[PDB]
Amino acid sequence: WMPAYACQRPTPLTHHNTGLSEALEILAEAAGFEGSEGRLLTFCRAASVLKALPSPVTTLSQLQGLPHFGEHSSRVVQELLEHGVCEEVERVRRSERYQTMKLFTQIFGVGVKTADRWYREGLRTLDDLREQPQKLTQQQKAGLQHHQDLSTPVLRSDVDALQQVVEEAVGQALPGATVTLTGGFRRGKLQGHDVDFLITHPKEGQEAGLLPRVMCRLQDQGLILYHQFERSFCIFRLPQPGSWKAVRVDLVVAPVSQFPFALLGWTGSKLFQRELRRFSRKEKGLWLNSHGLFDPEQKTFFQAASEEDIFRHLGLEYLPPEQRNA
DNA sequence: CGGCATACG
DNA sequence: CGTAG
DNA sequence: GCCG
Ligand SMILES: [Cl-]
Ligand SMILES: [Mn+2]
Ligand SMILES: [Mn+2]
Ligand SMILES: [Mn+2]
Ligand SMILES: [Mn+2]
Ligand SMILES: [Mn+2]
Ligand SMILES: [Mn+2]
Ligand SMILES: [Mn+2]
Ligand code: NA
Structure with a gap:
């Protein structure tokens, strides 16, 4: 059943x-x-x-x-x-252990291993971490400074505004390149804690080198509060009534050959993608990631022009994004 | 018992 | 080690 | 913790 x-x-x-x-x-x-x-x-x-x-x-x-x-x-x-x-x-x-690990791991730049080490050292609060800042990475410093804004839900209104600014920079960086909203917003969420975009170009190979050009243009417009290639994990300045707020934004580039695989992976959910990759390998003998789908017996990659193609290759009935909220 | 998804920064 | 879905 |  x-x-x-x-x-x-x-x-x-x-x-x-x-x-x-x-x-x-x-x-x-x-x-x-x-x-x-x-x-x-x-x-x-x-x-x-x-x-x-x-x-x-x-x-x-x-x-x-x-x-x-x-x-x-x-x-x-x-x-x-x-x-x-x-x-x-x-x-x-x-x-105490659950509450503190939840608090620490929700900081951008802190994973389970860092949070656990801090816990075992006696640290319990964000101000504890702020009191010894030279023990933090640049990413953790940004995660802590922006922690309050990053805990505030991102709304659909926010997403539409961010997409426009990303499109402007992408258009100067490479005319003809496109920007697709992915992640939880593509699955129908009305809020989220971050915004995800996937960028490609219809001419295979033209997207090479694109992400640095996009980042530099967003940085010169004063919109990047933090950045560190194919994937950029940023903190953007988003306008708000009479002020602004920090928002996590992920920018990803893929060539058009890989775009359906990247769209599928970045649309999620996390559990959906782990289960899809497990199904592919264990039930179909094929190896799936956000770049492609590999047959290890013939040593060939499947071509896909759409998410629909990928579900067909795997013998699965198609699920639109809003039914992937595993 | 082994396996548990699979990448990039 | 962190990040992503 | 559960599955095959
Ligand atoms: Cl991947
Ligand atoms: Mn997201
Ligand atoms: Mn790649
Ligand atoms: Mn994200
Ligand atoms: Mn076992
Ligand atoms: Mn066990
Ligand atoms: Mn038990
Ligand atoms: Mn009872
Ligand atoms: Na974290």
Whole structure:
């Protein structure tokens, strides 16, 4: 009934099991903070199964047969159904370790490994980190200075304004180049914590060298608060009533031959792409990334002119972006 | 039991 | 090590 | 943690 891989089923942005999925996602996040990537994946997959269901789970019997539900995830759901809270989830939520790792890992430039080392050193707050700044990378300094703005949701209005400025710089950098909105906004989200753009040109090879030219032009317009090639992880100055706010923007370039693969990868979701790559390799023997799809037996790359082509190569029914919210 | 996606900066 | 989806 |  329910397929085992998230790329085999539609997953809408909004659904009928929000509270249950959010609880399993807390456990997934906590597993990641402890380095348990296998448990993280199971909890993420179980949460995603619930997002794909056509109606609310009301009774434990409704889980039997569902993929990725074993003793642990089933008990979590049982406790939520019976009591409205899961004791393990609540213990994680209030724990100093979870709260501090969440705080630190949400800083741009800080991953689980850095956050854990800081935790073991006794650091607990953002001001703790600001008090010893020479121990920070340039990226972390920017992440900390802009942390408050970067925690503020990005709206669709913001996205449309950013796209116009990126298009202007891209047009001077290379006439004919195009800018496509990707990431969660392409999946239908009305808000987000960042904006993602994919840039190409219709003539294969003309996009070579493009991203430095785009970055320099945005920098000379005073729009770049931070930047560090094919991928640029920036902080942009976005106008606001009588002021402005910092916004994370990712700019990516791909040649038109690779564009459908890059569009698919950068549209996500993260779990969708991991599941699609797992399905490709384990079920079809093909190796997928955001550059291409490789047959390792014939030693050839599949040509694709669209996302539709990629789903067909993999033997999967097509899912539009708004059904990829695994 | 092994596997768990696969890139770039 | 960080970043991306 | 779960699956094959
Ligand atoms: Cl890639
Ligand atoms: Mn358990
Ligand atoms: Mn009980
Ligand atoms: Mn994004
Ligand atoms: Mn490349
Ligand atoms: Mn992004
Ligand atoms: Mn094992
Ligand atoms: Mn285990
Ligand atoms: Na981070």
